[model samples]
Structure formats: C-alpha cells, structure tokens
Target chain A: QRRQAILDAAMRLIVRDGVRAVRHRAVAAEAQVPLSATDIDDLITDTFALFVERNAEALSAFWSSVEGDLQEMAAVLADDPGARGSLVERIVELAVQYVQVQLTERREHLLAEQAFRQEALLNPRLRELADAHQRILSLGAVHFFQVLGSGQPEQDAKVLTSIILQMEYQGLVDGVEQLAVDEMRAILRRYLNLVMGL
Target chain B: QRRQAILDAAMRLIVRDGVRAVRHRAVAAEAQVPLSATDIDDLITDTFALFVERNAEALSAFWSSVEGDLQEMAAVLADDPGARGSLVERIVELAVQYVQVQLTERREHLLAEQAFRQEALLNPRLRELADAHQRILSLGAVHFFQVLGSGQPEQDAKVLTSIILQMEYQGLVDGVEQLAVDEMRAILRRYLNLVMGL
Candidate 1:
C-alpha cells in the first residue's frame, strides 16, 4: 500500500512534468507521507527496484488485461450497430480504439520506459529490464496479430506496436498535441485493408 | 530583423520545453534584445501577431520545400543501381528517409506547429493554418500512393503519414530515445512488401 501510494504520487508528477521532476522530496510531498530525505531516497529506490524485479510479471498482467478488453470488444462486435463496414474495417476499428486507450492511459508507463531505456545505455541491470520488457511486448503483439489472422502476422504486429510507442513524441499524454482517436482508426483500417487484400 | 529574432528565440524555447515556455522575458533574453520585461511584453505580442499574419505563407513555403525533396528523390530512384526492389518499397524507402531527415532537422518547426496547434483551439487563424498544413501533407501522401498505383491510395497515404507523425512521439527530436533511420527503412520496407503482395 505504501509503495503504491509512492508510485502513484511519483507517476502523477512524472506525467504532469517530465520524469526529471521526480525528486524524492516532491514525491514524498505529493504522497503526503512523512519521511526524511534519506528515507524518501531509499523508499523511491526500493520502489523502482521492486518494479524492476517484477517487470516481467507486470508486463504479463498488462497483456492479460488487454486480452480481457479484446474479449469484451469481440462480444460487442457481434451486434455492432453499423454492419455496413467491411470486416477488415470493423476489426481495425476495435484494434485502433484499443491501441488509443492503451497509449492514453499508459502514457506514463511509456514515458518511464523511454526514461529507463536512456539510463539503460549506462546501466546493465536497467538495460536487461528494458530488453526483457521490449521482448514481452513484441511477442505479445505477435500473438495478437496471429490471432487477428493477418497473413504476415509477425511483421504487422511489430508495425502496430511501434506506432503506439511512437505516440509519445507528439505530446499525446503531455497535451501538446494528440492523434485523434478516430483519426487513428482510419489510419489503421487502411493498413488492415491492405492486409485483408494480402 | 528584430521581429524575426524574437520569433526564432520563442521557437527555440518552445522546442526545448513547450509553447508554454515562451514568456516575453525569456524570448528577449534568448534573442539578446535589450528590453525590459515590460518592453518585451509588448514586443512579443507584435512578434507573434506578425507570425500569425504570415503563418499561411510560411506554411506554404514549408510544404513546397518538402515537395521539392520528394521530387529529387524520384529522380534519384530513376538511375538507381540494381535496386531490384518493388516500386512500393523503393518509393517508401525514399519517403521514409525524407520524413526522417525532415523531423530531425526541423524539430523546432514541429514544436512550433504543436504550440500553434494548441493555440488553434482558441485562435481561428492558427486553426486554419494547422488544418491547411495537414491537408497538404495528407493529400501529398495520397498522391504518392496513387503514383505508386496502390489500390487504396487514400487509406495507404493516411497510414504512411500517421507512421511519420507517430515517430515524432518516440523521441525523434528529444535525443533521448530515437527512431533510428535505418530501422525505420526496415520497418516500412516490410509493410511495403505486404502492400506489394496486396
């Protein structure tokens, strides 16, 4: 509970500002927890250490959550209001919305991923965590594409996944700019159309 | 000359932080203009007013420049050595390189665009400019797809442009994380391969 509070507070700050704003003092203040600077420092380190330790598990949980959403969406699609759309367009719409929500809600996680990845340049342990995290996301995406039955499942998965990751630069989470959710749907549907043709 | 200097300074700060960072005092300091906060306050209003007044023409020049680069690329592809690649792959490779170079070289312009777009929420002029810029880029992509004889020119073009836009979110300009140019080529090449099959 304590760690979650700290993480929640730290992430709020990281999202509002950049990760550079994540000072122990600020996090402690935000979390409204009483701690000395030393303890705060230690606590923050411990929190990140735990996250790193369970990174793989956290990733699997994320994917499972995504799978659950997909299942629910599949149920909705059976009675989708507009059956006039092509099958490829309908499927792509669901996938794009799923992607947009994931990117929007998980904005902090993506930024944190980028931050840790930069540190990975000099930190061996951090590098391993980023690489492992990346592998899981890639493999999970490959699984999704296979299920979606794109003939070139592996390649399509990578492209789709990368597109979501690329959203960070446009300030989607930071509010500088955004890819409108509907626009994202159109973009994905087009590629899916090509996939269907393939 | 002084107005241009101020705009240039404001854009630099905007790129570094965001549009919100462009305070009058900061712009004056950045431009090395001898003005008090009060004088700067007035000068900045005039500076930005000028910018908005010229925004349409400025955006046009930007689009024309991009078109020039694409035309040059087409010429390069013509006498290409045993490029033994499909036309879609060949064209996408050139387009990818062009987009990558534009993002890397024009980070300030992009951030300015983002800043202007945020203002576009309330400012009609900025909104018009932003929308116009988007249309040119989108229509340009559709034309490229048409030239390549893609079956779904409109859809493929949207995907192509969105991919480039997404790359910005991934640290294309931030220097922390980056979409490596070669990696981009490979990713797009794979998609173009599938598109060719389609």
Candidate 2:
C-alpha cells in the first residue's frame, strides 16, 4: 500500500507536471513525507521487476505484431500504382506513409487472418497456430511468393527483410538494441523498404 | 530582450537535463517574472520565431558529419567477420544504428558537408544524396559478381555489403522523411548504374 501510494503520487506529478516534477523533494512531499527516499527506490526496483516479468509474452506479441504489419504493407505495395513517383521526394513519402499505416492500421487484420494450432504467444495466439504466419513477415512473404512463383519482390524483400528482420529478432545484439523484441526490427525494416526500394 | 532571456534560460535547462528536464515553471523562474501567467504567451511566441530563424547552414553541416560516421561504420561492418548471431540481426543493427548516429552525431560535420551546397531545402538535399547511394547499393551481390568477375571475395566486398548498403541508404530516406523532407521517387534514375538490378 505504501509503495502503491507513492507510485500513484509519482504518476500524478509526472502526468501533471512532467517527469521533472517528480523530483525527490516533490515525491516526498506528495507522500506526506512519511516515506523515505530509500523506500521509493525499492518501489522502483519492484516496477523494474514487473517489467521483466512481462517481457516473455510481450516480446512474442511485439514480434508478431511487427511481422503482421510488414506482410500486410508489402502485400499492398506489391501492386500499388502509388509506388511510382517522378521525384525521389514523392516516392519516399509514399513509401514511408504506406509502411507507417500498414504497421498501425493493418496489424489486427493480419493477426485475425492467422489460425492457431498450438498454444501461441500470450495475446496474438493466431500466429503461432498458422504456418502462414509463423515466421516474422519477410519469411511469410517469401514463402507466399514461392507459392506464386516469382522472385523480384521476394528477393528484394529477403535482403530488405533480412536486414529489417535482423533488427527485429536480434534485439540489441547489433547496436542501439532499441528493439528488445523483434517488433522494433520488423517495424523498422518495413519502413526502410519504402525509402530504399525492395 | 525578455524573450531572448527566456530562450537562453530554456536552452540552459535543456542542456542541463535534456528534453526530460524542460517545464513551464522552470522557464518562468528563469525569466524572473512575477507577472501574470499570460506574459508567457508573448515570450514563447518570440522564442519560436527565433528558433525558426536559426542558421540553416549550421544545421545542415551537423547532419552531414553524422552521415559520414554512418558511412564509415557500414563500410567496416560490410566485411566484419566473427560477428556471431543471426546474419540479418547483425546487418539490421548496423542500419538502425547508422540511422540514429547520423541523426545524433556530427552536427558540425553535417554543417560542413553542406557548406559548399546551398541549402535548397536541407531535407531534399539529404534525400537526394541518400537516393543516389541506395541506387548504387541495390545492385547487391550481382554487382560484386560482375566487378570481381568471380563468385569469390577479393579486394572488394561481397553481396552482404551491397545488401547492407542498400538498407542504410534506405534508412536515411525514411529518417529524412520522418524528419519531414517527405520526398522519395525524386531519385533521378537515369543517372544511376542499373537501378535495383534493372
């Protein structure tokens, strides 16, 4: 109860006055000065613990979400007339917007398309169930193309997706590691495809 | 003068604590005002105008210096052996890192790179440069195959380099667009050497 109350005050301060408003002095004041700084630190540690506890399933959901976006976007752009533009500026804008929307808009739709067999990721159980959606997006697209008997898009997507997927799956192994899960990498790669052409 | 003072104070606070540290109350304190709250309206308006009027060449130079770092890292990683883990992960990390580094670093360098070139919409210039680069890169391993005239590595890089190079260039475009250049397809394909494998 003590920790939760402190956290509650901290949240209010942060939300109302920004993170800086939650300074040590401010937090102590918010909790009526009954709590020590050390106590607050312990609560933060607990929050971190909660973060770790959520990762296993969060990571899977994140990756599938990212892959789903990529597959949906790439599929749409495969024959998109808007893909062509006279100027590099126009072309890049179209690609970037298209990719961005796919990630945000088509995510749930793609997830719905998948069917589950085994116990899947905590939230999007559809992917783990369907072979069609099992692999992160590029792999799914590559196999799709194979079925259709073509290579230009797949080959490009493989190289494009590979780099994109790496950023997704490898997490922080390469550099910034902003992508603790494949989701970050998948989303990034899909965006890159428009700017560079895949 | 009042607005200038406020801008200077805000800048100081920004430097000291990063974006996380900025707040309305701090800015008011920095301005040394016991005036009504509405007084802030004018100062903020003037500060925004000043920001809009900042030197463009300086900003452009900073961006270029950062891009140079990206180019160097990509060159090194193109053949970085002993990079354990997924091949795509290794490459994607580099791409994501390059995009970030290019954005954060070499502000001075980017300014210098643009010294000779007039600032014809800085974002457009960067996009053009990136597009040219991606075009050269999208050739992939096939280009090396043609260049080395062999299926083996020699004095030059392999398909992996070509692939990564494409990803980096594309990354820049997407970054620039997000940064608000909003131009793709402006890449003049007529001047390039085989646009994305013909």
Candidate 3:
C-alpha cells in the first residue's frame, strides 16, 4: 500500500511537471511518508519500471489490434479472384484509418509519444522498445505493400512508411486545428493514388 | 534587473534539473529575489519567450548556412557541362554532410529540439515556428532533388525529406554506437541510388 502510494505520487509529479521535479521530499510529502532520499531513488526506479510496463502494454494492445485487422484484410485477398488491386487499396484505406486513430486530437496519446521519445534518450531499454515500435510499424507497412504487389517492394515500402510517419508530425505536431487529421488523410490518399499510378 | 535575474535562474534550473524543477519559490530563491508567486509567473513567461527567441536564432543560423551550401551545389549544376551527372552525386554528398552535422553527437541541439517540441504542445506560437522549421527543411530538400532531375518532384521530394528526418531518430534516439551516423549515411546513400535508378 505504501509502495503504491509513493509510485502514484511520483507519477503524478512526473506527469504534472516532467521527470526532473520528482524530489524525494516532494514525493514523500505527496505520499504522506517520511521517506529517505535513497528510498525515493528506489521509488523513482520503480515508477519508471511501472511506466515502461504500462507503455508496452498499451503499445502491444494497439499493435495486436492493428495486426488482427491486417489479417482479416489478408483473408479478403484469399477470398476472391475478382478483387485485383483491391487488396492494396483496402490495405491503404485501413492504414490511413490506423494513422487517424493513432493521432487526430488524441492529446494524451501525443503527449506520451513525445515523452517516450524524450525518455528514450536517457534509457536504453526505452530506446530499444522505441526502435522496435518504429521498425514494427515500418516493416509492417512494407509487408502490406509487398502483398499489394510492388515491383520495388523494398523502396516503395520505405518511402510509403516514412511518408505516413511524417504525417504524424504534420497532423499531431503541425496541425492543431480540428480538421488536420482529415487533411492529412486526404494528402496520404492522394499519395497512395500516385503510387498506384507508378 | 530583477526580471533578468529570475529568468537566468529559471533557465539554469531548467537546464540542470529539467522543466519540472522550475518551481516558483525555487526560482525566486535562486534569483535571490523575494518574489511572490505572481512574480515568478511573469518571470517564467519571459524565460519561455527568451527561450524561443534563442531557438529561432540558432535555427535561422543553421538554416542559412545550409541554404548557402545548397546554392553552392546548385552553382555546380551550372558551372560546366563536362562533368555530366556529377551534379546529382554532388548534391547527395552535400545532403549527407547536412545529416552528419545534425546527428553527430550534437547534444545541445538535440536536447533543444525535444524541449521545443514538448513546449510546442502548450504554446501555439512555438508550434507555428516548429512547423515553419519543418517546412523549411522539407522544401529545401525538395529543391535539391528537383535539381537532381525528379520527374515527380513534389511527391519524391516529400518522401526523401521525410526519410532524412526519420534518419535523425534512427541515429540519435535508436543508435547508441559511435558508428550510428555512418550506418545511417550508408543506408541513405543506398536509398538515393534506388531513387536514381527509378
């Protein structure tokens, strides 16, 4: 119970202020405990451990949900001979929806994204997870495009994945207005059309 | 005079302990000013304003230096017809140099980047400047690729720009090894070759 209280207080302080504000005195006061500085250090470590656990949990859930959708889309490819090019089109459509869900007015999600990126600078474990997250998204996009029958799957996948990632910056960071995500989606859809033309 | 002292104290605290450590009372004590809470509020406001100003100043210097280098490369395109196709290779070489500078353990620059991005989440003006910074880089890359003879100038330009931007994350956030920048530059060169082949 005391341990949970300390962690909860530390998390609140970290979120409200940023990582640097979690002094033992303040956290102890917040947790209603007269904890020592060394104890606070341990508590901070525990807090970060819990943070990564929850972050990984959220990410795995999202990734699996997206994967499940991708598999369902793949099933459509197996179902019919008449759907030439529809697999690629359907996949692109779903990918855009995924981007929309990931970004698009999700302020807390955006906050965590930046915070994690910043944290990755200091934490090797977090950095590894971040790289994994990026690779999973990019390589996953590449696979979907390859299944869509690209002559240059490697090049196209690299370009397409980067474009979609850049759109996160465009929508979440650049576009603060309500319609930013829709605008981003439209631009991406146009890019997809160009890829199809090529 | 007192305002400058408080602002100085806040900047030091922000640098030493991170943004969360800038409690009003803490800053006041550091400044040696018996400031009320409202005094710290005004001081924090001034500090952020000054922070953004310095940020814009540094970015402008970097961008201008880059632009100057780009113009010199463009001049190579016009200087002599005998060195056929070297213009494209020369441009790519310069582009790699650009990425090299941005990610070669340029610690303060990287820290400022994340700090500013986090600040942008709360400050609209900072967000606007950040967007402008992004566009300047992308459009600048677009110009370089256009000189390299892109048939689909805009789309190709956008993708290439995004690729380089993403490389910053790869080198800075993901790669902990000393050879990270070299690896990034090599892969980017390969990607450039593929673009040229297309």
Candidate 4:
C-alpha cells in the first residue's frame, strides 16, 4: 500500500510536471513518505505498469459484462437468417454501449491512460509499453468488427478507436456533462450507421 | 521578434515541463534573454494565440487551394445529373487530401496545439481560450459538411475532427513515418466512404 501511494504520487507529479520533472525527493514529498533513495526510472515504469494492470482489469470487467450478450447476438446472426437484416443496427447499438461503458464506467482509467500517452510521446522509454497498451485495447474492437463481417476490420477498429479517444479528450476539456449520454448515443449512432452502410 | 522568441521558449518549456513548471526565469534561460518581469499568464496566452494565428493561416491557405475546385464540383453536382453519382467519391478524395495536408504541412502547429490542449485540461485560465480555439477550428469543417448536405453537420464535423486529432496523436507517439501518407489516405478514404453512404 505504501508503494502504491508512492506510485500514485509519482503519477500526479508526472501529470502536473513532465516526466523529466520527477525526482525521488519530490515524489517522497508528494507521497508524504520519508525521503529515501528510489530509482526514478523504476518508479516511472512501475506507474505505467500499475496503469496497465488496472486498465486490463477494467477492460476485463467490461468484456465480462457485455461479452455474453454480444456472443449470443453473434450466434443468432449466424444461425438465424432473419437476423441478418438488423446486423448494422445491432452493431451500432453495441458500439454505442461500448463507448458509454468507457466514458462513464472507466473514465478515470482513460484519464490516466491519456496522461501516460502524452508522456510516452516525448519519452522513448515508455513508448513501447504505450504502443502495446493501445494494441491491447484495440484488439477487442478489431475482433468485434471482424466477427461482424467488416471488410477492413483493422482500419474500421482504428477509426472507432480514434472517435472514442476524441470523445474522451472532449469530455476532459469540456466537462463530461457537457456531452450528455444521449448526445454520445446519437453521435455513435450516426458514425456506425455510416460505417455499416445503413 | 524578441517577444516571439520568449513565447517560443516558453512553449518549449511547456512541452518539456508541464505548464505548471514554466516560470519566467526559465523562459529567459531557455530564450537566452536577460531575466525580467513578464506575466506568465500572458506569455502562455500569447503562445496559444500565436498557435491559433498560424493554424488559421494554414487553414486559410488550405481552403484557398481547394475551395475553387470544390465549388466548381459542387456546381456541377447541382447542374449535371451524372456528376451527382460522383459526389461521395469526390468528398472522400477531399477528406483524404485534408488529412494529408494536416499531417505533413501543418504538423508542427498540431504538435503545439496538442501541447496547449493537454495543459488546458488542467488549467482553468487556458480552458476558455482552448475551447474557443477548437470552435474556430471546427467551424470550417461544420460549414463544409453543411454545404455538402450533411444531416448533422456539427456532429459529423466533431467526428472528423476527433479522427484528425487521433491521427496527430498517433503521429506524435509512433513517429509520423509509422503512419505513411498512403495509410492516412486509406484510413480517411474508408471513413469518408462510410460517412457519405458510398
């Protein structure tokens, strides 16, 4: 728990100051811990590791919540010829739901993820981890699109991912309340409708 | 020019250190100018202002380069029945061109804009200017989509803007070369195709 507190403090400092501004003394001061020698590089790495662990856990929970229903829907689409006509609509609803879960349920994780991403932009040490983290996050979307018969699932997933990222960015800049849940649904509906060729 | 130099130095500091880490003394050292009193708030504000100014100039140039041709095409679509069928294709090409120009020609402005935007997320003083800057930037896209008969021009513009922001983010994190010009065209082509119902 003490280590977690230190990592949290380091993250706060990183968010307030760039990675270059982080130091053991500053972190100790922020964390309210006794000053001691700690590897700054290791501390930063651990912060990212903690983020990735939490992110994966959140993602896992999200998938567990929705996976059963989505899988059932996919099965129905495959076995029931009549279900074919509603594929686009179903996918759009799922996309909207996915985004809603991200914005509301996992908002804090996203805020931290973005901070790490910004740091990764200038810090080569974090680049690989950040890239890997993105790939992991997008993998589910890519697979979902593929199962839905997207011709270019990777590209489609990338587009959807970008939209979600922007939404998060906007939510941060202009309070999340500014972008009501209904507005998000409408936006995602329009985007998915176009993407699915409805 | 000295004022511009100081602003530039401040921007570099903001990028290297978070906005909170930027101090007047540091700006002087970075700029190699003798230390003197300059309102830190104004210096930061001026940096964003300069960015907005350059961004508008770049956007203006882009519009001028494409407006004449796009207007002619619009006129043709209105008058010539055959041209109507090609509207989606033309729009897709234009969208791809837009992303290409942003990634290549105005990349520096985007990097600085993003830095300010990240800072704005944590700083209230810059929030209003950042929001206004975004509104100005998106206005052109909204108008473009409206002129092209989009049902929800504002939403569509927002979606497009988000995609561009993500593209810029990707370029920064992975190096612009990672997303080749061709890949941008392909990505935008896929997106515009879906949006335009092609």
lDDT of residue B140 for candidate 1: 64
DockQ-best of 2 and 4: 4
Which pairs of residues clash in candidate 3, taking residues 3 or more apart in a chain or in different chains? none
Q: Which of the two candidates, 2 or 4, achieves a greater lDDT against the reference?
A: 4
Interface RMSD of 4: 1.9
Query: Which is superior by DockQ, 1 or 2?
Result: 1
- Which whole-number lDDT from 0 to 100 does residue A83 have in model 2? 44
Model 1 chain B lDDT-worst window of ten? B168-177
Q: Write the per-residue lDDT of candidate 3 for residues A1-198, one digit (tens) a residue.
A: 777788777877665666666788878888888856324445656776566556456556665777766677667657864554565466556666666766654544545555556666656556556665666555555665666555556556666666776776566665544535554554455455544443
lDDT per residue (tens digit) for residues B5-113 in model 2: 7775655544344323335687767667543431443343343333323423333443354455445444554566332223323334433554345444533222222
How far in Å is the alpha carbon of A168 misplaced in model 4?
A: 0.9
Among all windows of 10 consecutive residues in model 3 chain B, the one with the lowest summed lDDT is B37-46
Sort all candidates by lDDT, best to worst: 4, 3, 1, 2
Q: Which residue pairs in candidate 1 have backbone atoms (N, alpha carbon, C) closer than 3 angstroms, thus clashing? A: A168-B169, A169-B168, A169-B169, A170-B169
Cα displacement (angstroms), candidate 3, residue A91, comes to 3.8
- TM-scores of the models, in the given order? 0.62, 0.32, 0.67, 0.86
What DockQ results do all the predictions give, each relative to the true complex? 0.20, 0.04, 0.35, 0.58
lDDT (Cα atoms) of all candidates against the true structure: 0.56, 0.36, 0.61, 0.73
Summing lDDT over every window of 10 consecutive residues in candidate 3 chain A, give the lowest-scoring window.
Answer: A189-198
RMSD of 2: 16.6
Clashes of each: 4, 31, 0, 0
Candidate 1 per-residue lDDT, tens place, A1-198, comes to: 876788767756544554345677777788888655224444444444444445456556766767865565445546763332455655666566555554567555544554444333333344445555555556776776665545767667667766555433333433434556665665666666665553
Tell me the tens digit of each residue's lDDT in model 4 across A40-154: 7778889988888888787777667767767877888689746754765666666567666666776666667767876777678888888788787777778677776676788
lDDT score, candidate 4: 0.73
